[PDB]
Amino acid sequence: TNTLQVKLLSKNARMPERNHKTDAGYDIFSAETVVLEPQEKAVIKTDVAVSIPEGYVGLLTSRSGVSSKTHLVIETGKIAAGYHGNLGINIKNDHEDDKMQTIFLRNICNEKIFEKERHLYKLGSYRIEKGERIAQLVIVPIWTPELKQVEEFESVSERGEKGFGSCGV
Amino acid sequence: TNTLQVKLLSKNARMPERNHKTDAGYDIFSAETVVLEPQEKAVIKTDVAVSIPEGYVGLLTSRSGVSSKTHLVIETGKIAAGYHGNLGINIKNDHEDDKMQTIFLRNICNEKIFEKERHLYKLGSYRIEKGERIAQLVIVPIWTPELKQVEEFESVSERGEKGFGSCGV
Amino acid sequence: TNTLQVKLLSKNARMPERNHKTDAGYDIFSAETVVLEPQEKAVIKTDVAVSIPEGYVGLLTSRSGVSSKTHLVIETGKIAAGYHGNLGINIKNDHEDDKMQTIFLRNICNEKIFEKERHLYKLGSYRIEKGERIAQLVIVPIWTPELKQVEEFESVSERGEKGFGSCGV
Numbered sequence: 001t002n003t004l005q006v007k008l009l010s011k012n013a014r015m016p017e018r019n020h021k022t023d024a025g026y027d028i029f030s031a032e033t034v035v036l037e038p039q040e041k042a043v044i045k046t047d048v049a050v051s052i053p054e055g056y057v058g059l060l061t062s063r064s065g066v067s068s069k070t071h072l073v074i075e076t077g078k079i080a081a082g083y084h085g086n087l088g089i090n091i092k093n094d095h096e097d098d099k100m101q102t103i104f105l106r107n108i109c110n111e112k113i114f115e116k117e118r119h120l121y122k123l124g125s126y127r128i129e130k131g132e133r134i135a136q137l138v139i140v141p142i143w144t145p146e147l148k149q150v151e152e153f154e155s156v157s158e159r160g161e162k163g164f165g166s167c168g169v
Numbered sequence: 170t171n172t173l174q175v176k177l178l179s180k181n182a183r184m185p186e187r188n189h190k191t192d193a194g195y196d197i198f199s200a201e202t203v204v205l206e207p208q209e210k211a212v213i214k215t216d217v218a219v220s221i222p223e224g225y226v227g228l229l230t231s232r233s234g235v236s237s238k239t240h241l242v243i244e245t246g247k248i249a250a251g252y253h254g255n256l257g258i259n260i261k262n263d264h265e266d267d268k269m270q271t272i273f274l275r276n277i278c279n280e281k282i283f284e285k286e287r288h289l290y291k292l293g294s295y296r297i298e299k300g301e302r303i304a305q306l307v308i309v310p311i312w313t314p315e316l317k318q319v320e321e322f323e324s325v326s327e328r329g330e331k332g333f334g335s336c337g338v
Numbered sequence: 339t340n341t342l343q344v345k346l347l348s349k350n351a352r353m354p355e356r357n358h359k360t361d362a363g364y365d366i367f368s369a370e371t372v373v374l375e376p377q378e379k380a381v382i383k384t385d386v387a388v389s390i391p392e393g394y395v396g397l398l399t400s401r402s403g404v405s406s407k408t409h410l411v412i413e414t415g416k417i418a419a420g421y422h423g424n425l426g427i428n429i430k431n432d433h434e435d436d437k438m439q440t441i442f443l444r445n446i447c448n449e450k451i452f453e454k455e456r457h458l459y460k461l462g463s464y465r466i467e468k469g470e471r472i473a474q475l476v477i478v479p480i481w482t483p484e485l486k487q488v489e490e491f492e493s494v495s496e497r498g499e500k501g502f503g504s505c506g507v
């Protein structure tokens with residue numbers, strides 16, 4: 001079959017988008033407005049549920065814009081088949097806590113947020129607005145064979161017990 | 170074929186598990202007991218060898234629990250076909266070194282470890298116990314065609330030389 | 339078809355390599371010489387363009403050597419089909435800014451760079467040389483079905499609305 005089922009869990013949820021046939025995955029939006037201070041960790045709720053069929057895995061991963069411009073680090077989530085719960089974005093503000101203060105929050109593009117009401121924030125703080133495009137979902141097929149414990153392998157390769165950790169060549 | 174070969178390299182090794190037909194990959198366990206101080210890097214040995222056939226790649230990656238609860242960051246390892254050596258978990262404790270001390274170690278769930286014997290640790294330190302479930306392996310098929318150097322591409326797309334780095338839209 | 343088209347954008351560009359039939363992906367080289375101070379972010383240009391066909395995605399990802407030896411963190415780039423622009427390596431030097439000074443730069447293998455001309459650098463600084471092998475590209479097939487909004491899913495699974503965030507079991 002060529003259909004994926006999507007359940008919206010609230011009015012704050014936004015439907016994933018795949019504009020262009022050339023695009024790899026689906027744009028994921030935040031359903032929460034959240035301020036992340038330097039070094040702070042959170043799981044941002046999308047209020048979106050997905051039904052991935054067997055033989056596939058979803059990759060809830062970062063986008064080039066947010067990750068390259070800001071210190072907001074998204075850990076790629078392995079969305080298993082059958083998981084019909086709320087998709088959470090595993091995020092960390094990886095800006096260092098330098099103990100310095102500023103009156104400007106930063107957006108998901110590293111642009112300064114101008115406010116009428118003046119407030120003091122810790123330098124390196126970000127704000128993710130409700131409805132903002134911060135992640136993407138890329139679904140790839142998986143191979144899940146039966147495991148067999150062996151003492152030696154059937155086919156000896158030309159790479160072998162090497163080579164973990166090779167820099168400089 | 171629908172079989173994957175697994176070699177245990179020591180008695181400390183633990184067999185990877187795929188409970189449920191709905192699960193994406195295989196649970197990987199640590200074979201070492203290791204204390205990671207803030208900002209410390211290590212390669213944790215599993216004492217497990219795997220024989221991935223050609224046309225596939227293994228993804229030695231994080232789990233939602235450990236990564237969301239703790240500052241333990243696992244870099245996804247690309248397990249090549251033919252690599253029959255020890256699978257190492259590329260890990261870093263990404264807690265900041267604030268120079269502060271505590272008498273509590275943190276486990277892989279960010280819970281405080283209570284000890285009868287009192288010791289002073291640096292705040293943000295974690296302990297990975299031998300046998301603990303800290304990673305997972307997801308095997309996906311790969312496309313490895315022959316490369317052809319061109320001056321211009323055959324099919325001009327509608328995405329084009331764009332678009333790297335787009336935030337805010 | 340079993341062919342991938344590659345365009346070199348400058349003389350500084352280097353052709354991706356896939357030595358051995360056992361290897362997962364293609365070795366990517368830097369086209370820039372760049373010094374990254376602690377906590378600094380950059381997008382390193384490869385001056386290499388690729389034409390990935392539809393039904394596939396490229397994974398511009400780290401290698402075991404650089405990532406395990408150094409604090410240089412590469413965020414895996416999702417190279418979409420049709421993207422014919424310059425492939426950029428999304429990188430961050432994740433060494434902490436301890437305010438300390440040294441006369442040695444570190445290479446991509448964490449080895450000290452010896453210089454005839456003496457200079458003062460911030461401790462934790464790295465230098466990526468033009469032509470150095472720092473990344474790899476692994477191409478995997480993608481599933482991109484049509485989306486259908488539902489109120490409830492057709493097939494209820496045995497995993498269910500669980501289980502996000504499970505450590506310690």
Ligand SMILES: O=c1ccn([C@H]2C[C@H](O)[C@@H](COP(=O)(O)O)O2)c(=O)[nH]1
Nearest residue numbers: 077079080083087088090232233502
């Ligand atoms: O960033 C993430 C990671 C995981 N999950 C969901 C999907 C998985 O099916 C489930 C369990 O994750 P693991 O513990 O298997 O990583 O949690 C998310 O929603 N977001």
Ligand SMILES: O=c1ccn([C@H]2C[C@H](O)[C@@H](COP(=O)(O)O)O2)c(=O)[nH]1
Nearest residue numbers: 164246248249252256257259401402
């Ligand atoms: O986290 C990792 C990364 C790599 N490898 C193994 C599998 C690869 O076949 C080999 C070489 O890795 P690269 O240098 O190709 O990344 O090291 C691991 O065991 N764990």
Ligand SMILES: O=c1ccn([C@H]2C[C@H](O)[C@@H](COP(=O)(O)O)O2)c(=O)[nH]1
Nearest residue numbers: 063064333415417418421425426428
């Ligand atoms: O590290 C990266 C990430 C992305 N891209 C390119 C490929 C994508 O087609 C395009 C858009 O990226 P996203 O915004 O979709 O992540 O930028 C890179 O060259 N390097």
Ligand code: NI
Nearest residue numbers: 076228245414
């Ligand atoms: Ni990944």
Ligand code: NI
Nearest residue numbers: 094095263432
């Ligand atoms: Ni950090």
